[PDB]
Every structure is written in structure tokens, then in C-alpha cells.
């Protein structure tokens, strides 16, 4: 503890995400909505918005 501020221990946690190429396993909190067809809508499929 007698060291300076440039020599203190630092705990590092690195979160590495894999982008969506496979089926999604981990996903954030969002409320699902029933599917509609043959209408111009705004879709959010697994984080892909259009």
C-alpha cells in the first residue's frame, strides 16, 4: 500500500461478446410481441431492427 497511484493493483474483467451468427442463447430483457404478417410493420428480430 505504500506505492504510488501508478503501481497499485488493478482488477480487470473483460467481457467478450460473440456476434449473432448462431442461434442466440444469451439475450437481454425485452418483452416479446405476437407475430403479424402481410402488413408493413417495424420488426425487432434478435436485435436486428427494420
Amino acid at each position: 500500500p505504500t506505492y504510488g497511484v501508478g503501481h497499485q493493483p488493478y482488477r480487470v474483467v473483460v467481457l467478450s461478446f460473440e456476434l449473432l451468427h448462431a442461434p442466440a442463447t444469451v439475450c437481454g430483457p425485452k418483452k416479446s410481441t405476437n407475430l403479424v404478417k402481410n402488413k408493413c410493420v417495424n420488426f425487432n428480430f434478435n436485435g436486428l431492427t427494420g
Binding site: 506505492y3 504510488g4 497511484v5 501508478g6 503501481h7
Partner: protein, 50 residues
């Protein structure tokens, strides 16, 4: 107001041993990169202290 200037010439500059000498976070450089200071090399160095 009376900062000290020192000329560094005719030696072999190891910039990897600066870090364990003073407790500073960032080796803030402007025209070069701190990790690439050994591959490229210079003509003269001027060190100003205040």
C-alpha cells in the same frame, strides 16, 4: 519559470524502463506512439523538467 533542460545524445534509449521508475498512468505522446519508440529512432532528445 526556470525549468530544467537536459540534452540526450550518443546513447541507446530504452523506453520500456521508464514505467517502473515513476508512478504515472499514461505515457502521453503526440507525434509518436509509446509502444513503437524502440523500432523507429531519432537524432536528439531534449528533456524538460518542472
Amino acid at each position: 519559470y526556470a525549468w530544467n533542460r537536459k540534452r540526450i545524445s550518443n546513447c541507446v534509449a530504452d523506453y520500456s524502463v521508464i514505467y517502473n521508475f515513476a508512478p504515472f498512468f499514461a505515457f502521453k505522446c503526440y507525434g509518436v506512439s509509446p509502444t513503437k519508440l524502440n523500432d523507429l529512432c531519432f537524432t536528439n532528445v531534449y528533456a524538460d523538467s518542472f
